[PDB]
């Protein structure tokens, strides 16, 4: 289960970085770099702060997952410059809800306290997109009007509450990922903003 | 003593990040993120390079300190968009002088050599503001005309000299923080620049 | 041999950062900061991810090497604002080819797998320039039309192939650095781009 959620979150963040590079008409190598930065960005910061081995260093198959996602994005998509902005936000939304819960879960079971685990979950979910946006000189997600970081904090905090209610990790994460994803997708499809 | 200087430097850097978010009319969650990035930014890089536990991971009360400073900045201040720029510089100035000395002191007593300890002190003082400025697409402090990094290098180097003269840490840091703060505040109140 | 290649790559990356600061007419302290960020940027990320001591923390003479390169750039060059852009690219090109091979070699002999070692080599070669470019609000190298990251991936991958063919490290790195440097210099002197 966890094995499949990590790969899916990595493919998803690599897809958002690969699409972002397609807007700039970059060559395939620039696409792989921008896709790799978004895929591992939040995870590397999370593992380093936790003093634990980095996930793609400990398991090199993540790198082949990123390269495969970037290469498929290059060949399967004709004109990436005219790609709609909704597909980029939906991509960043999936990895945001996933890694916000997985990051909190991984930190909690590594000994991190409750508030530290939630913070490390939000870092895993938003840091990869923040580095991607500053490299392309684009306004980061947290500075836009739509709800963003609230969805990340919601996923990690809901996992802690369900974990405290003695739910198993599988049911606690599924509800936490769905609640974080529903709030972010609603803020994208309906442009919901907070004052 | 050290316990109170760390909290004050964290409140101060969190205040500068919270005020910066107020200029962009961000929601409370975007304010907490930008305040947290500035508060822990330099400290996290310092502890990671030192291969020591991160301060807010080892002591979660720093996170509650950041959240309390960010929330108070949201409710106690009416219109943050029209806030004067002097209060932002004074905020960044306090955390700059504090963490430049505390970072050097923490590194030196963890086994870091003299030049490494001073470099780690300047990193602790300026890195948090650098990440805050690039996220908001604002020119970083080091690229502006007023004296900035010199005040950081001055605080850490003065601590080493006073420590070599067999001053206790309390008196060595108080003079080092004041000398670094006086130079930066003078460069803000009188716009002093270096050719 | 390795001792001389590390110093040369550090001097070279510190030179590119010092020249970049000269365009903005920064004071000497802002020059040292920007030169230090470019010199250690890729190396610090490489060592941190590898859970190994940072090179300039373990050996403080790198810091004196950076400060000496930055100071010499300040005094030996009259007008740095009118410095040609070719000298900046050639500077970043030398450190790119060097650290892409040295980073892969250092990671491989520290236990990192083949794909992890190559990724860590490319990170060591491009991360320092990426941080330098975003601080100055300049378009990063990977977003430009000329060949860049391909030269970094080429140096690290060629080292692995020659290492697999039972070449000693000295001959494997010399060919790997030259092949990566020739591709990048050709893309600078002739403005070669990839579609």
Numbering used by the authors:
A (entry chain A), B (entry chain A), C (entry chain A): 4 to 198
Please quote the paper that reports this structure.
As evidenced by the fact that their genetic ablation led to compromised K+ permeability and Ca2+ release across the SR/ER membrane, TRICs play important roles as counter-ion channels for balancing the charge potential change during Ca2+ release/uptake in the intracellular stores. In this study, we analyse the structure and function of a bacterial and an archaeal TRIC channel. Both proteins have similar structures, consisting in symmetric trimers of 7-TM subunits, each composed as inverted quasi-repeats of triple-helix bundles (THBs) plus an added TM segment (TM7). Many other trimeric channels, including ATP-gated P2X receptors, acid-sensing ion channels and the mechanosensitive Piezo1 channels, form central ion-conducting pores at the three-fold axes of protomer association; by contrast, the prokaryotic TRIC trimers have three pores as calculated by the HOLE programme, one through each protomer.
Different from SaTRIC, the bacterial CpTRIC was solubilized in octylmaltoside (OM) and crystallized from detergent micelles in space group R32, with one protomer per ASU. This structure was solved to 2.4 Å resolution by Se-SAD. The final model for CpTRIC was refined to Rwork/Rfree values of 24.0%/27.5%, containing ordered residues 3–198, 5 Cd2+ ions and 27 water molecules. Overall, the two prokaryotic TRICs are very similar, with a root mean squared deviation (r.m.s.d.) of 1.39 Å when 188 Cα atoms are superimposed. Interestingly, each homologous repeat forms a structurally similar THB, with r.m.s.d. of 1.32 Å/79 Cα for SaTRIC and r.m.s.d. of 1.45 Å/71 Cα for CpTRIC. Another ion-binding site was also observed at an inter-protomer interface in the trimeric channel of CpTRIC. One Cd2+ ion was bound to a well-conserved Asp residues (D40 in CpTRIC, located at the N-terminal end of the GGG-kinked TM2), and interacting with several backbone carbonyl oxygen or nitrogen from the short linker between TM5′ and TM6′ on the adjacent protomer (residues 145–149 in CpTRIC). In keeping with the closer similarity of SsTRIC to the closed conformation of SaTRIC, an H-bonded network of interactions closes the C-THB in a locked conformation in both SsTRIC and RsTRIC, just as in the structures of both SaTRIC type 2b and CpTRIC.
